[PDB]
Amino acid sequence: MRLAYVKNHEIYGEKLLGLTLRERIEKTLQRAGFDVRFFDELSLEEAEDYLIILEPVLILERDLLLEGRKILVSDGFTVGYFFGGDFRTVFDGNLQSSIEKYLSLNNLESYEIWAIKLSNDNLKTAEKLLLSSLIKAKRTGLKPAYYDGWIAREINRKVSLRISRLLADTSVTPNQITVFSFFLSLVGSALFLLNSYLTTLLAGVIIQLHSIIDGCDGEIARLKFMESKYGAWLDGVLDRYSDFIIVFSITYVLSASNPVYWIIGFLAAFASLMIAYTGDKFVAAYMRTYSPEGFAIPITRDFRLLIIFACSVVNLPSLALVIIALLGNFEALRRIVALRS
Amino acid sequence: MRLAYVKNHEIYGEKLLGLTLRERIEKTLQRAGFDVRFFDELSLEEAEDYLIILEPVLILERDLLLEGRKILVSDGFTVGYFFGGDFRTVFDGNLQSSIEKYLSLNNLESYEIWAIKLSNDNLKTAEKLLLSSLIDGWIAREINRKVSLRISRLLADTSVTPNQITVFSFFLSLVGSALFLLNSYLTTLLAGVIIQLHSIIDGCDGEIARLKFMESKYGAWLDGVLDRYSDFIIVFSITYVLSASNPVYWIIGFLAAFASLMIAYTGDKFVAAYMRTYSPEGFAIPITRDFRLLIIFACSVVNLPSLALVIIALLGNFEALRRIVALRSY
Ligand SMILES: Nc1ccn([C@@H]2O[C@H](COP(=O)(O)O)[C@@H](O)[C@H]2O)c(=O)n1
Numbered sequence: 001m002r003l004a005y006v007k008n009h010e011i012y013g014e015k016l017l018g019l020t021l022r023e024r025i026e027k028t029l030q031r032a033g034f035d036v037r038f039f040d041e042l043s044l045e046e047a048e049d050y051l052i053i054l055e056p057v058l059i060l061e062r063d064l065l066l067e068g069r070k071i072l073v074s075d076g077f078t079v080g081y082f083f084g085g086d087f088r089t090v091f092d093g094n095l096q097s098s099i100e101k102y103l104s105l106n107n108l109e110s111y112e113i114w115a116i117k118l119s120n121d122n123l124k125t126a127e128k129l130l131l132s133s134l135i136k137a138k139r140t141g142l143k144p145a146y147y148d149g150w151i152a153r154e155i156n157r158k159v160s161l162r163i164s165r166l167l168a169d170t171s172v173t174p175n176q177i178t179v180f181s182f183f184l185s186l187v188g189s190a191l192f193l194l195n196s197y198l199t200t201l202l203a204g205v206i207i208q209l210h211s212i213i214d215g216c217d218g219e220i221a222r223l224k225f226m227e228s229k230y231g232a233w234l235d236g237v238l239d240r241y242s243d244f245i246i247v248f249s250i251t252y253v254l255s256a257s258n259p260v261y262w263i264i265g266f267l268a269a270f271a272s273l274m275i276a277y278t279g280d281k282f283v284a285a286y287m288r289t290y291s292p293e294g295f296a297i298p299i300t301r302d303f304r305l306l307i308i309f310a311c312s313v314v315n316l317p318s319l320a321l322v323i324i325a326l327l328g329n330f331e332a333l334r335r336i337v338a339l340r341s
Numbered sequence: 342m343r344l345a346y347v348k349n350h351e352i353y354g355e356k357l358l359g360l361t362l363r364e365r366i367e368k369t370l371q372r373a374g375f376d377v378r379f380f381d382e383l384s385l386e387e388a389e390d391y392l393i394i395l396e397p398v399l400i401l402e403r404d405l406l407l408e409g410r411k412i413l414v415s416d417g418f419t420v421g422y423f424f425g426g427d428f429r430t431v432f433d434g435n436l437q438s439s440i441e442k443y444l445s446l447n448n449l450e451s452y453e454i455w456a457i458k459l460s461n462d463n464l465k466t467a468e469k470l471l472l473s474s475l476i477d478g479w480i481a482r483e484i485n486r487k488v489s490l491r492i493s494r495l496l497a498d499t500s501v502t503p504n505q506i507t508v509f510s511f512f513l514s515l516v517g518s519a520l521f522l523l524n525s526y527l528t529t530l531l532a533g534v535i536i537q538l539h540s541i542i543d544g545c546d547g548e549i550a551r552l553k554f555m556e557s558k559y560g561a562w563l564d565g566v567l568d569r570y571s572d573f574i575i576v577f578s579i580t581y582v583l584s585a586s587n588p589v590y591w592i593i594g595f596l597a598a599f600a601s602l603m604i605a606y607t608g609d610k611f612v613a614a615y616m617r618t619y620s621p622e623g624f625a626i627p628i629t630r631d632f633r634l635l636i637i638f639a640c641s642v643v644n645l646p647s648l649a650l651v652i653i654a655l656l657g658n659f660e661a662l663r664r665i666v667a668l669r670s671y
């Protein structure tokens with residue numbers, strides 16, 4: 001057992017994006033493997049490790065790991081104290097004094113964690129930073145199947161985070177967003193079948209909307225601590241259905257004009273599914289996030305859907321199939337070669 | 342650090358399926374987290390734990406776990422002694438005496454492990470049991486393994502690696518696919534046979550990996566990836582030929598390919614998300630890879646590969662859907 005002692009402050013009672021700052025620090029520290037104790041006056045109980053947090057803080061990092069004596073800091077400011085079990089031998093019933101003594105006996109290295117000290121002044125800033133911590137990027141401490149591609153990071157998350165901000169104050173769940181997003185991909189696919197510029201343009205727009213909103217399920221999951229194994233599985237599975245059905249619809253319409261597009265469609269669908277499969281099979285076999293260093297063809301899902309959108313607005317959905325088939329199949333083969341080392 | 346002391350025996354020098362019995366017990370005990378010491382006369386070094394093996398044995402368990410002092414037995418026969426660090430406080434330079442003493446101070450429980458005591462008599466039996474200890478579905482396990490183990494038995498005494506088998510297996514699937522493209526009953530029949538051969542041989546990579554301690558993460562990744570390529574290319578080849586007679590088969594082929602890929606994806610995504618093997622506890626539609634290839638083989642021998650596409654498209658898509666619903670609880 002590891003104990004996290006958190007000193008009470010009235011500001012913890014304030015709600016930030018659907019949860020009190022109190023439950024936020026509680027849930028983050030629990031995820032980090034600590035039993036939490038809020039206190040006005042500290043009474044020390046037995047544990048292997050002690051984490052002490054005196055000033056009100058919002059922890060933004062996702063995968064906090066605490067091994068060995070350290071002082072936790074955020075931009076030079078002390079966030080909390082991580083003391084060893086031997087703190088018992090020092091504690092004299094006065095917290096202020098006992099910390100002073102323990103620090104004089106030890107030479108604690110400072111350790112940087114992503115956090116923001118809470119004040120009545122800067123909650124708007126806390127909100128902005130909390131939202132920014134929801135993206136799938138190694139910078140946040142998250143450890144997903146794989147991280148956001150460049151389009152996701154610089155285009156799509158900018159929009160979806162603003163949607164998630166509004167959803168945070170509702171009862172909407174991640175699984176509901178995942179299913180709704182899947183449904184949107186079906187609407188887009190149906191629009192392709194109507195075989196006209198107007199509906200093809202609309203299909204493209206709705207597919208890019210789908211791409212954006214598909215980021216909200218993960219954002220809300222992380223934002224309200226509603227992540228689940230099934231949720232991660234379902235989101236991946238339905239994204240595969242979406243990718244296939246979108247290509248199927250475009251291919252089906254085009255095949256009336258030239259049967260050669262069945263071949264291109266087959267290859268585009270295969271490529272789309274295999275970019276996802278090579279990544280998830282990596283996680284399955286290696287038990288770590290898939291995240292290659294250096295060169296890689298940008299043909300992850302955020303790119304594929306943007307390409308479908310762009311080609312659709314100029315009424316050339318056929319071109320999207322060609323690009324995905326080419327780029328996607330080359331990237332899959334490249335991944336095979338690159339991973340051997 | 343934990344030390345495994347293994348008494349020398351001439352029988353350890355004999356090769357069993359590509360490795361000496363010495364190398365086998367060494368690698369098994371290393372995998373289990375022990376540093377190995379072969380000995381005629383025992384000299385004790387410092388460690389948290391001691392494992393002592395006096396009689397020549399082949400250990401068949403792959404994930405051996407030793408927590409707390411025990412006597413290791415196989416069908417009542419003592420395989421080895423697992424003593425605590427305090428054995429140091431007892432050891433007097435004579436192994437026989439020290440074991441007697443340590444056992445009189447302790448009341449060790451017996452712990453059952455899968456192993457076989459080695460003699461010049463039962464090495465044929467050792468080979469059979471070792472092959473049997475090497476672990477896509479019920480067809481794979483209960484039909485195909487009967488043939489693949491016999492192939493793996495022969496490959497074990499060569500330098501062939503799991504990755505080489507995986508790539509050769511992939512190549513066979515391409516040969517089968519090419520045969521479908523030639524569009525005649527004879528070549529469709531041959532395609533079916535080669536696809537089932539591919540199914541059988543594809544299990545050899547895992548057998549050889551475990552048998553020769555050559556498992557790797559990349560090997561597991563590569564087999565899965567190339568199996569997806571194979572499933573797609575086989576269906577593509579059948580569909581392409583059929584599309585000449587009726588374009589509706591493009592649709593069925595599309596659905597058969599998707600189904601094949603999604604059965605694999607739902608399974609591997611499960612491992613990625615849950616960090617456990619995917620294994621339903623009750624009913625499931627039998628449409629894992631071993632079944633799919635058998636269906637293609639069977640339909641091909643009566644010149645109806647089109648029926649294989651319909652069956653895979655139907656069973657595979659329903660099974661994917663079933664998994665979605667079922668896992669909402671699991
Ligand atoms: N229904 C959902 C959707 C996403 N998630 C979480 O979000 C991750 C995916 O993030 P994105 O949706 O932002 O790409 C999943 O792997 C899982 O950790 C979830 O837990 N339940």
Ligand SMILES: [Ca+2]
Nearest residue numbers: 214215217235
């Ligand atoms: Ca999503």
Ligand SMILES: [Ca+2]
Nearest residue numbers: 543564565568
């Ligand atoms: Ca396989």
